[PDB]
Amino acid sequence: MRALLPYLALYKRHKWMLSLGIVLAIVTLLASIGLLTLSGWFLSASAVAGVAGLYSFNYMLPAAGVRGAAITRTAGRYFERLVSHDATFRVLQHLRIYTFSKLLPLSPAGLARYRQGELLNRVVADVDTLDHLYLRVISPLVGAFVVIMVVTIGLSFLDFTLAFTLGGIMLLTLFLMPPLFYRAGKSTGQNLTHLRGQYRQQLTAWLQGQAELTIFGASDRYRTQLENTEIQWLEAQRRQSELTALSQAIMLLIGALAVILMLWMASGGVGGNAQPGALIALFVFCALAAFEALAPVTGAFQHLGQVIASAVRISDLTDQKPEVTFPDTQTRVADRVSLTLRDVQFTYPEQSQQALKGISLQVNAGEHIAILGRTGCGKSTLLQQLTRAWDPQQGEILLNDSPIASLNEAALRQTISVVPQRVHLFSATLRDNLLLASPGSSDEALSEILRRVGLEKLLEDAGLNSWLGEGGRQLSGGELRRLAIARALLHDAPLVLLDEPTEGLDATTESQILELLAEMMREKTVLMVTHRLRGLSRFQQIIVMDNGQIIEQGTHAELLARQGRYYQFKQG
């Protein structure tokens, strides 16, 4: 329960409404106990009085409590569900922002080891299970504590050796059972999230390699392997449901032990009088109705083990040290940046392959550059070095005759605008997908840039407010590439380095943007990286690299005239 410390400090921001949602969970749980205890005594008090003493018996005060203890049992429950769900939703906001803030400096490098689709579905699932802490673990356990105390202090007035037994039995089952079952299920919980991940990798391997597995005959013996991890996985689940069933047979036997004891012990005498009279049904109906407060406690040993596991998975993810750090020094962003490389080497962490070995190049101001190479040659990795996603081992990068490690983080984003290979379409509006680049751009200027990229079709039917993204209006692959270039125009950086534009297009539209790149970014040092050769005559100093090293470079004619690698794979 040490893992929860960074996240129990986010609750403290909303401590004064979390407690209100808890107090209502105590007033409601006290009306339920009070209504059944008062009614139980009232039947026994009146029946003992009988017909003979009906006039002396006052049936107007208890009948005023019942009218009151029933209007707080239903108004409290309605407000305990709102005020508690309201508090859970407000804590979620502080958890979404906290997770995003810590996962932001680690975005390219701290998450490269995992699977981005698989990881980011785990992180969203984890932040959801931290909300369960208040509703499933804290409110059921804190609320069940002060309910026991007040129904022990309250019944302490009538007698003490009795009210202590309810206090005793109900508090040990509150303090001893949640630990003794969390501890018992600790072994399977770690053995159940291991077999779930194991079954997920074996299923992904089976489904992906569905073409290779069938042909070589192995599609059957990797299904049996997959179906045998499931069998073990479904015994870890069973050993975990046989432990939720056991924690329900204990709270029902413990609840029996309290009722049987107050049926026996309260028979001897309640307080002074040896015969208790109606008070023997006040104790028994309190013992019977008090274990309503501890019904949520039965299942809170499981919902705690999930939050502990989730707080570990997300404190691990967000406590990684960033692979790059930016100086605090201020600087003035300057146009016409002349980028240079001097023998930068790079090896991805936990790996032996050198993904980028001994690459060096020179890009003067205004000098468009094209980098060409096969798939998996490390061209996009060279472009991660320039945006400071990683740091090159034993290398040196200079941006306008000064090291790029000396630029302020905010200033660096101003002097380098990139067009990512995987263009991302945020779910927000079109205006919010273009103000992404420049936040203060006017609505009119934002329209004409999107007009000049040749994406006029998006300006129809109130396009600037249309909801494109995951919700609807999904852009095609062809016109999603035109959107990224639109952002790189709003941002207006002196150096605009592109990563495989004109990829996945057709011949007629890829010549549109590739002309657009050299039409408006004439004053920019482009440094385009593509594996598709087209219209490279406008680019000077074409650079060809294979396997993380520049094979040969020069102007378009020079590699074509000279017998070289570029000339070789140009034709044929």
Partner 1 sequence: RQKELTRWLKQQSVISQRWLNISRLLGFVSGILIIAQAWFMARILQHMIMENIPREALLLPFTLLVLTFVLRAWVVWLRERVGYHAGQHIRFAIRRQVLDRLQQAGPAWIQGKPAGSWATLVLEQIDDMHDYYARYLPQMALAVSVPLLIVVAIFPSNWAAALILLGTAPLIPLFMALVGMGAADANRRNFLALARLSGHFLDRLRGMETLRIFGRGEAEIESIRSASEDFRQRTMEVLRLAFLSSGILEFFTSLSIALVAVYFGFSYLGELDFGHYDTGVTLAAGFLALILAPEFFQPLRDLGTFYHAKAQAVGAADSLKTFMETPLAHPQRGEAELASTDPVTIEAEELFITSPEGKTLAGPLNFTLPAGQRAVLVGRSGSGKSSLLNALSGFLSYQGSLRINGIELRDLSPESWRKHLSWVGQNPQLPAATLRDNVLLARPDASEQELQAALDNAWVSEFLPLLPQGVDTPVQAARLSVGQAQRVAVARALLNPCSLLLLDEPAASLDAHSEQRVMEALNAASLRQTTLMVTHQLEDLADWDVIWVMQDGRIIEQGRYAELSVAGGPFATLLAHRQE
Ligand X SMILES: Nc1ncnc2c1ncn2[C@@H]1O[C@H](COP(=O)(O)OP(=O)(O)NP(=O)(O)O)[C@@H](O)[C@H]1O
Known binding residues for ATP are 373-380
The answer to whether residue 203 forms part of the interface with partner 1 (CB under 8 A) is: yes
Distances (CA, A) of 6 to 132, 171, 308: 16, 28, 12
Q: What is the footprint of partner 1 within residues 333-392 (CB under 8 A)?
A: 348, 351-353, 355, 374-377, 387, 389
- Asked whether the beta carbons of 496 and 417 are under 8 A apart, the reply is yes
State the first-to-last Cα distance of the chain, in angstroms, to the nearest integer: 64
Distances (CA, A) of 58 to 48, 54, 286, 538: 13, 8, 22, 102
Q: List beta partners, residue 499.
A: 529
- Asked whether the beta carbons of 130 and 8 are under 8 A apart, the reply is no
Candidates 83-91, 301-309, 451-459, 474-482: pick the segment binding partner 1 (CB under 8 A).
83-91
The residue assigned the tokens 């059957």 is: 220
Task: Count CB neighbours of 492 within 10 A.
Answer: 14
Of Mg ion, ligand HEB, ligand X, none, which one does residue 112 interact with (CB within 5 to 8 Å by kind)?
ligand X
Tokens matching residue 393: 């081992």
Helix segments in 12-60, DSSP class H: 15-49
Q: What is the footprint of ligand X within residues 352-371 (CB under 6 A)?
A: 353, 355
Task: Count CB neighbours of 133 within 10 A.
Answer: 24
Task: Kindly state the smallest distance separating residue 302's Cβ from ligand HEB, in Å.
Answer: 12
Q: Give the contacts of 212 (CB within 8 A, at least 6 positions apart).
A: none
Of ligand X, Mg ion, ligand HEB, none, which one does residue 408 interact with (CB within 5 to 8 Å by kind)?
none
Task: Kindly state the smallest distance separating residue 298's Cβ from Mg ion, in Å.
Answer: 53
Q: What is the footprint of partner 1 within residues 509-568 (CB under 8 A)?
A: 531-534, 546-547, 551, 565
Query: Which amino acid, one-letter code, is at 77?
Result: R
Q: What is the footprint of ligand HEB within residues 77-116 (CB under 6 A)?
A: 81, 88
Candidates 162-170, 377-385, 505-513, 520-528: pick the segment binding Mg ion (CB under 5 A).
377-385
- Asked whether the beta carbons of 18 and 87 are under 8 A apart, the reply is yes
Tokens matching residue 38: 């008062």
Task: Kindly state the smallest distance separating residue 535's Cβ from partner 1, in Å.
Answer: 11
The answer to whether residue 406 forms part of the interface with partner 1 (CB under 8 A) is: no
Task: Kindly state the smallest distance separating residue 281's Cβ from partner 1, in Å.
Answer: 6
Nearest residue to ligand X, scored by beta-carbon proximity: 380
Size of the site for ligand HEB (CB under 6 A): 5
Which of residues 143 and 494 has its CB atom nearest to ligand HEB in the complex?
143
Of ligand X, ligand HEB, Mg ion, none, which one does residue 132 interact with (CB within 5 to 8 Å by kind)?
ligand HEB
The answer to whether residue 73 forms part of the interface with partner 1 (CB under 8 A) is: yes
3-state secondary structure of 563: coil
What is d(CA 500, CA 510) in angstroms, rounded to the nearest whole number? 11
Which of residues 135 and 516 has its CB atom nearest to ligand HEB in the complex?
135
Long-range contacts of 74-79 (CB under 8 A, 24+ apart): 76/24, 76/27, 76/28, 76/31, 77/28, 79/24
Indicate which single residue of 10, 112, 203, 389 sits in contact with ligand X (rule: CB under 6 A): 112
Which of residues 354 and 421 has its CB atom nearest to Mg ion in the complex?
421
The answer to whether residue 551 forms part of the interface with ligand X (CB under 6 A) is: no
For ligand HEB, the binding residues (CB under 6 A) are 81, 88, 131-132, 135
For Mg ion, the binding residues (CB under 5 A) are 380, 421
